[PDB]
Design a protein around this ligand. Structure first.
Ligand SMILES: O=C(O)CCn1c(-c2ccccc2)c(-c2ccccc2)c2cc(C3CC3)ccc21
Length: 135
């Protein structure tokens, strides 16, 4: 039956992006990829099937897909083509996604707030806020 994270399940569309270009600079994304990725307005599709959660992006830039079990580390290739080790957990209602590569790590936290899904992307001291609403 249902689970708390069923509040993330559905189809979402990006409506607000703040400081993403500075986040991508901290991550190390090069110029052309920053400009083309920063223009994108991806939809995000989140589904659950038993213990397996799947998060997809769909856009004019890249379509990405990850499927995972909470707390169980996996391999991920990101939209900017980094090969990372990822682990996703739930901390009180917040989906916390840690990506590690080449000695660096970034954390992407997804939480519901009103009718929005608010995504905070953190790399060292730079934070980007990406707000989605239901599509
Ligand atoms: O919601 C966010 O934006 C954070 C997670 N994330 C996504 C994404 C992932 C799943 C669903 C919807 C968007 C993209 C993304 C996917 C497709 C097209 C454009 C961007 C993304 C790109 C980056 C650049 C690597 C630095 C960092 C985090 C990223």
């Amino acid at each position: 039956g249902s689970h708390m994270c069923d509040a993330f399940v559905g189809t979402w569309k990006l409506v607000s992006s703040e400081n993403f270009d500075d986040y991508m600079k901290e991550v190390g994304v090069g110029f052309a990829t920053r400009k083309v990725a920063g223009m994108a307005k991806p939809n995000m599709i989140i589904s659950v099937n038993g213990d397996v959660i799947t998060i997809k992006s769909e856009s004019t830039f890249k379509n990405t897909e990850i499927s995972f079990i909470l707390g169980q580390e996996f391999d991920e290739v990101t939209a900017d083509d980094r090969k990372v080790k990822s682990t996703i957990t739930l901390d009180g209602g917040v989906l916390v996604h840690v990506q590690k590569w080449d000695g660096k790590s970034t954390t992407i936290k997804r939480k519901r707030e009103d009718d929005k899904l608010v995504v905070e992307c953190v790399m060292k001291g730079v934070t980007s806020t990406r707000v989605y609403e239901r599509a």
